[PDB]
Amino acid sequence: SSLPVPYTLPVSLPVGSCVIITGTPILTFVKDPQLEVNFYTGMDEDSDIAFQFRLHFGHPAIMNSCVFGIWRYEEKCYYLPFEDGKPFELCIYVRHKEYKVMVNGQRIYNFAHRFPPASVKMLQVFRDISLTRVLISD
Amino acid sequence: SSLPVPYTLPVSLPVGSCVIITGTPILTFVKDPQLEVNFYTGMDEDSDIAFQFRLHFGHPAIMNSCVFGIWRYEEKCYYLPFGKPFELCIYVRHKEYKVMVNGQRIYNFAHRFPPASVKMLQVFRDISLTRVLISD
Ligand SMILES: OC[C@H]1O[C@@H](O[C@H]2[C@H](O)[C@@H](O)[C@@H](O)O[C@@H]2CO)[C@H](O)[C@@H](O)[C@H]1O
Ligand SMILES: OC[C@H]1O[C@@H](O[C@H]2[C@H](O)[C@@H](O)[C@H](O)O[C@@H]2CO)[C@H](O)[C@@H](O)[C@H]1O
């Protein structure tokens, strides 16, 4: 199983459900490879986004100088160790108050709802990933 | 064993020298573990910094909402998987520093001060430091 990218899917995300997204980072085309996941409150792509999750597959490295006490122009790059992306499982579990965000089974964040989870109507997954599965589990 | 952190060291950085820093990241005490290396142009706390290298050991993740076409308050965290020991080499060339992590060149930083202006090295934040040396 392999899915097109960008991937768009009508969804219903009640409390207790989890959005499972598995894939592999593609590190060979862009300098800052990332994964982006959007929960839309409607079906047009000008509808509101109740929740966006963006994950950078590299490590940020930031370089600058400080002259007269003032930090100057920041130069940034993304350190990519290994050019084989590690496969990942993204799990977004829907709780009453928040989305519980898990990467490879490890909770990294709890994003408090800014819309009722019932208002989410569509999911979009795209950028620098080879997509293996996208499903709604309970 | 670990060298003291912060680690501060008077240095001379001629073209052709490399700043070699090895150590292991410490991932268990702060949400955003980093390594910070500063090249100072004098020996004082207030001195100018000719070059700062800051590396995040985690993967940044950013979350937000978009309402009425406007992105709102961005919420940020860092995914820390699995730290493996690292080697950072900052190679001093005529026109730039060549930044090397684990033997991989990741960036060429154009000099903003003459590298002869650098007088002091400082290394600190979330690392167990193994070696700091300058080799020519
Ligand atoms: O660029 C080096 C300096 O950055 C400062 O933090 C930056 C930071 O990189 C950025 O994300 C922004 O949001 O805040 C600061 C820019 O004003 C550090 O505090 C400073 O010590 C230097 O590292
Ligand atoms: O929340 C991330 C958000 O960034 C967008 O670009 C923004 C950005 O928030 C900001 O730096 C600046 O003000 O311009 C844009 C509008 O605010 C991305 O377009 C979007 O996909 C998100 O990733």
In order, the DSSP letters of A54-95 are EEESSEEEEEEEEETTEE---EEEEE--SSSPPPEEEEEEE-
Give the pair of three-digit tokens for residue A19. 């959005």
**Which residues sit opposite B90 in a β-bridge?**
B19, B99
Q: Measured between alpha carbons, how far is B20 from A86 in angstroms, rounded to an integer?
A: 28
Q: Could you tell me which of B54, B56, B62, B51 has the C-alpha nearest to residue B33?
A: B56
Over the Cα atoms of chain B, what is R_g?
17
Q: Tell me how close the Cα of A100 comes to any Cα of chain B, in angstroms.
A: 12
Q: Measured between alpha carbons, how far is A11 from B64 in angstroms, rounded to an integer?
A: 19
A70 close to B (CB below 8 A): no
From edge to edge, which strands make up the β-sheet containing B127-135? B104-110, B96-101, B86-92, B18-25, B127-135
B56 close to A (CB below 8 A): yes
B112: helix, strand or coil = coil
List of chain B residues whose C-beta atoms are within 8 Å of the C-beta of residue A50: 65
Cα dihedral sign, B7-B4-B15-B97: negative
B20 class by beta-carbon count within 10 Å (0-12 exposed, 13-18 middle, 19+ buried): middle
Q: Measured between alpha carbons, how far is B68 from B85 in angstroms, rounded to an integer?
A: 46
Q: How far is the CA of B29 from the centre of ligand 1 (A)?
A: 21
In order, the DSSP letters of B115-136 are GGG--EEEEEESEEEEEEEEE-
List of domains in chain B: 7-135 (2.60.120.200)
Contact between B92 and B115 (Cβ < 8 Å): yes
Q: Could you tell me which of A88, A76, A71, A95 has the C-alpha nearest to residue A129?
A: A88
Q: Is the CB of B73 under 6 A from ligand 2?
A: no
Q: What torsion, rounded to 10 degrees, do the Cα atoms A38, A39, A40, A44 define?
A: 50
A3 close to B (CB below 8 A): no
- DSSP conformation class of A3: B
Q: What single-letter amino acid sits at B9?
A: L
Q: Measured between alpha carbons, how far is B96 from B108 in angstroms, rounded to an integer?
A: 6
List of chain B residues whose C-beta atoms are within 8 Å of the C-beta of residue A115: 65
Q: Is the CB of B76 under 6 A from ligand 1?
A: no
